[PDB]
Scaffold this active site. Structure first.
Site, PDB file in Angstrom:
ATOM      1  N   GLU A 139      33.027  38.496  47.814  1.00 54.89           N
ATOM      2  CA  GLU A 139      33.479  37.780  46.689  1.00 54.89           C
ATOM      3  C   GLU A 139      34.626  38.823  45.898  1.00 54.89           C
ATOM      4  O   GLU A 139      34.859  39.721  46.332  1.00 54.89           O
ATOM      5  CB  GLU A 139      32.040  38.448  45.673  1.00 54.89           C
ATOM      6  CG  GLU A 139      32.031  37.829  44.300  1.00 54.89           C
ATOM      7  CD  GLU A 139      30.856  38.373  43.645  1.00 54.89           C
ATOM      8  OE1 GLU A 139      30.416  39.435  43.885  1.00 54.89           O
ATOM      9  OE2 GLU A 139      30.327  37.648  42.767  1.00 54.89           O
ATOM     10  N   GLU A 241      33.223  35.649  33.039  1.00 53.74           N
ATOM     11  CA  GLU A 241      31.920  36.253  33.006  1.00 53.74           C
ATOM     12  C   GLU A 241      31.681  37.212  31.970  1.00 53.74           C
ATOM     13  O   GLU A 241      32.430  37.910  31.321  1.00 53.74           O
ATOM     14  CB  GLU A 241      31.691  36.991  34.324  1.00 53.74           C
ATOM     15  CG  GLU A 241      30.412  37.796  34.812  1.00 53.74           C
ATOM     16  CD  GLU A 241      30.187  38.123  36.062  1.00 53.74           C
ATOM     17  OE1 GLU A 241      31.437  38.119  37.040  1.00 53.74           O
ATOM     18  OE2 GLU A 241      29.299  38.627  36.306  1.00 53.74           O
TER      19      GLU A 241
END
Length: 272
Positions: A139, A241
């Site tokens: 990620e 986010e």
């Protein structure tokens, strides 16, 4: 070396600051990438129903560089809204040549996104042949900005107390130093279920809300430090986010483009 593209289709991010209208909005978890009509891009939302109202609204194919969106969150539990390239076609990063993203957005202020938050570029990659099983799934984040929190200003770059992991090195690109960090997520949720995988971060030392990200430069520097991405890039998207808080993100420009080393455009979006 690598020639910066000068193609006139590239929108100057510094002055690309007109508020957009006519969004198309998504208020629930998308369950992965969803393609956008008349666009090369896809969006994804992760909106934990344990928390309050969130949304991502795409500004469409024909304004704002083609990938612009707004997002809102009201006491989320780790809201992620993202939009950009979706790949997942068994190719390494280098297949996509020199990837750039021009951006310009407004956002809510300090301490409106909980204790951690991220704005910038995000994706995953797969590397099944890696000898270390921890490194077979990756990620990644290129972090241009964040919301700070009670303890740390949003003008101060996040460090390993927020990301976890180890500082591997640094470099300078696009007007700032970036700290490069590798973290291991042990038995955590992923695109492949609950498992151990690695996270790569570049943290911009001088946070900003507009400019150009030379994305491939990060990928190259990570690989030189032994942070390999492998042979199956999943995506490369612009992300907001928010760990918690009540806030917003509103892009006037998100424009992805790709160019070869001569600087000629391979892909770009969108008479007098």
């Amino acid at each position: 070396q690598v020639v910066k593209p000068t193609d006139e289709r590239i929108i100057d991010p510094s002055t690309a600051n007109t508020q957009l209208t006519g969004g198309v909005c998504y208020n629930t978890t998308s369950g992965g990438n969803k393609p956008l009509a008349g666009s090369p891009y896809g969006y994804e939302t992760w909106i934990d129903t344990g928390g309050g109202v969130c949304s991502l609204c795409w500004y469409g194919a024909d304004q704002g560089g083609g990938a612009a969106f707004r997002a809102t969150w009201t006491n989320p539990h780790d809201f992620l809204g993202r939009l950009g390239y979706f790949w997942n076609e068994n190719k390494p990063y280098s297949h996509y040549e020199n990837i750039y993203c021009g951006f310009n957005y407004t956002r809510s202020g300090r301490k409106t996104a909980g204790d951690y938050s991220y704005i910038g570029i995000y994706g995953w990659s797969r590397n099944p042949s890696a000898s270390n099983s921890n490194e077979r799934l990756i990620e990644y984040y290129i972090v241009e900005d964040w919301f700070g929190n009670q303890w740390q200003a949003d003008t101060s770059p996040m460090g390993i107390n927020t990301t976890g992991g180890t500082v591997m090195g640094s470099f300078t690109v696009d007007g700032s130093s970036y700290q490069i960090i590798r973290n291991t997520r042990v038995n955590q949720p992923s695109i492949e279920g609950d498992k151990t995988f690695v996270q790569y971060f570049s943290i911009r030392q001088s946070p900003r809300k507009s400019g150009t990200i030379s994305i491939t430069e990060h990928f190259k520097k990570w690989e030189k430090l032994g942070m390999k991405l492998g042979d199956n890039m999943y995506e490369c998207k612009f992300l907001i986010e928010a760990g918690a808080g009540e806030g917003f993100f509103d892009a006037r420009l998100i424009q992805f483009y790709r160019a070869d080393n001569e600087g000629n455009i391979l892909q770009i979006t969108p008479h007098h």
